Amino acid sequence: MNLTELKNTPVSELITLGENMGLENLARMRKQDIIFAILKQHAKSGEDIFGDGVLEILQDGFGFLRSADSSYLAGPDDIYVSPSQIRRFNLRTGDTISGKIRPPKEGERYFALLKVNEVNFDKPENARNKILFENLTPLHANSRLRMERGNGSTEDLTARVLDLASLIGRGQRGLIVAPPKAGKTMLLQNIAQSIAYNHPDCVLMVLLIDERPEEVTEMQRLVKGEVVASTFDEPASRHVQVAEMVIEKAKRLVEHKKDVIILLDSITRLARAYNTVVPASGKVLTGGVDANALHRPKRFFGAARNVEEGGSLTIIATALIDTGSKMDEVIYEEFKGTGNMELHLSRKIAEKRVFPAIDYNRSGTRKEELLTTQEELQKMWILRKIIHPMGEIDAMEFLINKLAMTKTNDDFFEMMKR
Amino acid sequence: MNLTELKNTPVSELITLGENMGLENLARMRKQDIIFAILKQHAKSGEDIFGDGVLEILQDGFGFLRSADSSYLAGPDDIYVSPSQIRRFNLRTGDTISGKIRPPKEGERYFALLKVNEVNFDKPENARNKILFENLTPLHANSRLRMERGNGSTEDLTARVLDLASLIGRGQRGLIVAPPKAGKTMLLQNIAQSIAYNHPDCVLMVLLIDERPEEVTEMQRLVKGEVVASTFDEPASRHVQVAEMVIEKAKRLVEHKKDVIILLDSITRLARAYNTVVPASGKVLTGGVDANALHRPKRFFGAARNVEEGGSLTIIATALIDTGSKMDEVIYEEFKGTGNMELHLSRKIAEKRVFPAIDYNRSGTRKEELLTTQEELQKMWILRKIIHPMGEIDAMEFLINKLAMTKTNDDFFEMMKR
Numbered sequence: 001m002n003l004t005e006l007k008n009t010p011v012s013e014l015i016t017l018g019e020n021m022g023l024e025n026l027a028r029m030r031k032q033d034i035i036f037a038i039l040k041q042h043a044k045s046g047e048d049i050f051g052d053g054v055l056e057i058l059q060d061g062f063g064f065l066r067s068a069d070s071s072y073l074a075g076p077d078d079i080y081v082s083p084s085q086i087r088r089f090n091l092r093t094g095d096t097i098s099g100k101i102r103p104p105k106e107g108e109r110y111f112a113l114l115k116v117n118e119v120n121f122d123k124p125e126n127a128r129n130k131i132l133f134e135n136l137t138p139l140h141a142n143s144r145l146r147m148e149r150g151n152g153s154t155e156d157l158t159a160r161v162l163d164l165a166s167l168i169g170r171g172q173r174g175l176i177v178a179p180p181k182a183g184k185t186m187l188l189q190n191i192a193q194s195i196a197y198n199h200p201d202c203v204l205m206v207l208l209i210d211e212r213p214e215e216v217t218e219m220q221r222l223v224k225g226e227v228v229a230s231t232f233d234e235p236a237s238r239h240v241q242v243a244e245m246v247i248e249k250a251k252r253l254v255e256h257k258k259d260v261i262i263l264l265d266s267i268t269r270l271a272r273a274y275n276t277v278v279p280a281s282g283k284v285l286t287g288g289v290d291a292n293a294l295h296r297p298k299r300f301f302g303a304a305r306n307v308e309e310g311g312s313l314t315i316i317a318t319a320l321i322d323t324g325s326k327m328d329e330v331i332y333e334e335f336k337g338t339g340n341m342e343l344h345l346s347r348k349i350a351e352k353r354v355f356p357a358i359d360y361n362r363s364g365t366r367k368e369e370l371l372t373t374q375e376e377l378q379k380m381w382i383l384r385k386i387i388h389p390m391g392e393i394d395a396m397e398f399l400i401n402k403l404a405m406t407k408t409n410d411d412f413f414e415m416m417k418r
Numbered sequence: 419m420n421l422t423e424l425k426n427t428p429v430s431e432l433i434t435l436g437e438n439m440g441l442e443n444l445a446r447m448r449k450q451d452i453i454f455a456i457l458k459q460h461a462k463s464g465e466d467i468f469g470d471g472v473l474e475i476l477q478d479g480f481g482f483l484r485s486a487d488s489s490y491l492a493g494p495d496d497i498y499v500s501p502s503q504i505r506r507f508n509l510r511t512g513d514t515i516s517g518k519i520r521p522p523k524e525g526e527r528y529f530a531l532l533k534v535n536e537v538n539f540d541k542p543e544n545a546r547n548k549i550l551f552e553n554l555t556p557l558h559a560n561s562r563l564r565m566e567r568g569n570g571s572t573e574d575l576t577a578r579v580l581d582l583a584s585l586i587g588r589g590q591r592g593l594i595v596a597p598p599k600a601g602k603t604m605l606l607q608n609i610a611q612s613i614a615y616n617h618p619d620c621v622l623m624v625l626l627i628d629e630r631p632e633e634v635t636e637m638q639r640l641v642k643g644e645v646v647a648s649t650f651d652e653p654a655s656r657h658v659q660v661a662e663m664v665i666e667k668a669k670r671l672v673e674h675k676k677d678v679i680i681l682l683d684s685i686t687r688l689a690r691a692y693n694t695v696v697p698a699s700g701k702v703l704t705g706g707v708d709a710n711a712l713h714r715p716k717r718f719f720g721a722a723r724n725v726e727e728g729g730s731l732t733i734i735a736t737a738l739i740d741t742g743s744k745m746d747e748v749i750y751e752e753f754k755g756t757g758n759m760e761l762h763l764s765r766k767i768a769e770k771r772v773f774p775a776i777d778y779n780r781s782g783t784r785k786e787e788l789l790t791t792q793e794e795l796q797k798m799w800i801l802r803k804i805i806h807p808m809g810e811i812d813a814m815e816f817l818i819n820k821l822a823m824t825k826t827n828d829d830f831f832e833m834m835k836r
């Protein structure tokens with residue numbers, strides 16, 4: 001049987017499956033414990049057992065196949081891979097390994113990988129000869145990711161305003177600058193629907209850091225792609241771990257010429273987690289931010305690029321402002337000019353219960369001429385000139401009215417022309 | 419007899435009963451000591467002795483049934499539970515066990531459990547087949563907890579303002595941000611009265627950390643549920659132990675499809691106790707707070723959720739500000755955005771002797787559309803639009819003035835519409 005199918009069943013069915021084959025007292029233990037006990041019980045009978053997971057390599061040399069179902073949390077059901085296997089196949093962290101596994105022997109605590117069947121959704125020989133991510137040439141985004149779905153209404157105005165204000169291309173480095181309760185979470189959710197419906201080919205990953213468990217459940221049940229999260233209950237080490245796990249998996253996928261999109265909420269919380277984890281270097285900036293603490297977060301943000309050889313890595317991360325913590329302000333100030341797309345939300349627009357609370361004038365994209373054609377760019381500059389003189393709330397109200405009058409951004413543009 | 423009646427008996431009547439049995443020198447020792455002496459003297463007679471308690475499994479394997487009457491304080495009247503019983507009945511910390519108990523034998527210092535009769539207010543065989551707490555998927559609160567009472571005080575008007583300002587649902591994660599002497603204690607008292615009157619089915623728990631003994635007595639004599647408190651003249655380990663017992667018992671009750679509400683005063687004192695207890699990790703934040711120190715309080719505060727499978731855990735904790743202690747502000751900083759509901763008390767409103775001193779414009783609830791109907795939500799949005807331009811002192815003066823002229827919140831909204 002398969003490990004992923006077991007991890008995808010709810011706890012009740014896992015308990016029933018364990019009980020009807022001989023296991024007992026499975027109800028009160030953790031899901032990973034139930035899965036591990038079921039795996040051992042099935043292995044006692046001797047049938048082939050399959051599994052898969054994203055490889056994480058530890059300092060000692062051996063590695064473990066973490067599962068995205070549990071957001072790459074270490075557990076009894078993790079699959080052990082020996083350094084001999086990590087050297088026989090040239091494997092790095094973030095590699096998606098799928099194959100047969102074997103029960104632990106006397107003196108082993110984890111299931112061990114038996115036969116490698118696929119590496120990064122490809123044969124091991126082909127994945128053996130993939131150029132490393134850092135050897136690829138970054139480029140400006142040139143393939144637009146359209147947000148207008150064309151299937152929804154009465155909230156698709158958010159996607160249409162996104163298309164009017166901030167252009168997202170394959171390989172974009174997007175930063176969403178929003179105060180708390182400004183609508184960033186469901187803005188990301190609507191972006192997720194836009195990406196899933198418009199671009200099924202792109203691999204979509206949603207990364208949540210220090211996020212409430214109920215929102216984690218909503219995001220998981222709501223997004224069609226892969227959602228991994230680390231709640232505020234877990235330590236900053238877990239936030240770090242999931243951050244590198246996601247970024248390494250994305251890099252490995254991009255190495256196979258795949259477009260990978262990562263929605264991050266938030267870069268500020270990840271920066272705080274990194275500041276907590278990394279040792280103090282003796283130089284501490286204002287707000288308690290260690291100077292060296294922001295190196296690793298930026299490396300996460302700087303991985304977003306359009307690869308000339310093939311594929312791309314788009315990263316759209318949210319930045320928190322006006323939260324009352326000056327360390328968040330410092331983190332934002334260190335991440336200001338890093339991204340090439342900016343999307344600003346304002347509390348003033350959100351207070352009047354009018355959404356999306358996008359600050360149209362302060363939002364924009366760099367090198368936007370590559371994403372679209374000349375005439376669409378002319379129409380967008382006409383719209384920019386029209387919107388510019390008037391204030392944030394008036395701009396958003398005007399945009400929402402004119403978009404609600406029409407059905408598509410095109411008809412809105414001819415209506416502006418007329 | 420049954421131990422619960424003995425522990426709820428006043429000390430004087432306990433002394434008289436023990437003297438009637440034939441004991442002596444009872445008056446001048448601890449209440450637990452008198453209870454233990456009475457239990458031994460009566461068990462010498464030979465008829466059945468009953469007991470109730472909450473299980474706390476020690477690091478050595480065995481456990482102790484504690485009592486909420488003494489706030490789970492270790493004492494001679496604790497019931498001893500062998501690891502064999504923790505294995506035969508699948509038992510965890512926080513389980514409520516009631517059954518026969520037996521006198522200590524030679525070399526035994528505690529009464530020992532003899533026959534397990536009821537676990538978590540259920541038969542032992544049913545309690546072992548309950549899915550563990552963190553195997554249940556969290557959800558947003560959808561069942562509102564009405565604060566407005568049919569009692570009709572008409573001098574306090576706190577529950578009505580709570581309804582007008584911040585909604586509380588089943589599974590809510592609420593945070594009360596208040597300066598000292600602003601009305602925290604009686605705010606929690608009104609919340610507890612509303613919970614007891616409107617929702618008798620919900621299990622109500624009041625958790626007090628570093629609390630003055632007089633207010634512990636007041637809270638016990640006022641709240642109709644369970645009050646477990648730890649005074650400031652006790653070690654931080656005592657506070658931590660009380661918190662773990664309360665949270666584990668709440669989780670075990672939620673596992674039985676029960677709605678459990680915990681009122682905590684305060685999360686700041688609990689964070690200080692955890693910081694004192696936990697070993698230093700080498701990374702100390704501003705204000706002398708260890709990085710890992712806040713990991714365990716969050717696991718408390720993050721345990722609040724609405725369970726899809728049934729039941730919920732609401733936690734309303736008070737956060738303290740303007741105390742002049744950098745530890746307090748930092749604790750507030752890592753607890754700022756972790757709650758669904760926020761309710762802010764203002765010193766300036768309190769010093770005007772107008773109550774409740776709720777900062778209406780800064781208090782609110784996330785996903786409040788899931789707790790009320792569309793019409794009530796529209797009326798509440800209208801009220802927020804009216805109040806938003808006003809200053810918080812003036813806002814509360816206006817709100818109380820308008821509320822006093824009406825009897826119910828619905829009548830208040832109808833008057834506002836007119």
Ligand SMILES: Nc1ncnc2c1ncn2[C@@H]1O[C@H](COP(=O)(O)OP(=O)(O)O)[C@@H](O)[C@H]1O
Pocket residue numbers: 155158178179180181182183184185186187355356784785786
């Ligand atoms: N595009 C939108 N349409 C309707 N309501 C919105 C929109 N954006 C935000 N809101 C409102 O804002 C509230 C909170 O938004 P949320 O996405 O949680 O922002 P944040 O993640 O910054 O807290 C929601 O209850 C929702 O009603």
Ligand SMILES: Nc1ncnc2c1ncn2[C@@H]1O[C@H](COP(=O)(O)OP(=O)(O)O)[C@@H](O)[C@H]1O
Pocket residue numbers: 574576596597598599600601602603604605773774
């Ligand atoms: N809802 C209220 N109604 C009337 N008086 C209040 C109220 N809340 C606070 N007070 C006043 O505040 C004083 C103490 O409030 P308390 O509940 O001790 O606040 P805290 O717990 O923050 O010290 C009381 O003497 C009382 O006069």
Ligand SMILES: [Mg+2]
Pocket residue numbers: 184185
């Ligand atoms: Mg959010």
Ligand SMILES: [Mg+2]
Pocket residue numbers: 602603
């Ligand atoms: Mg008080």
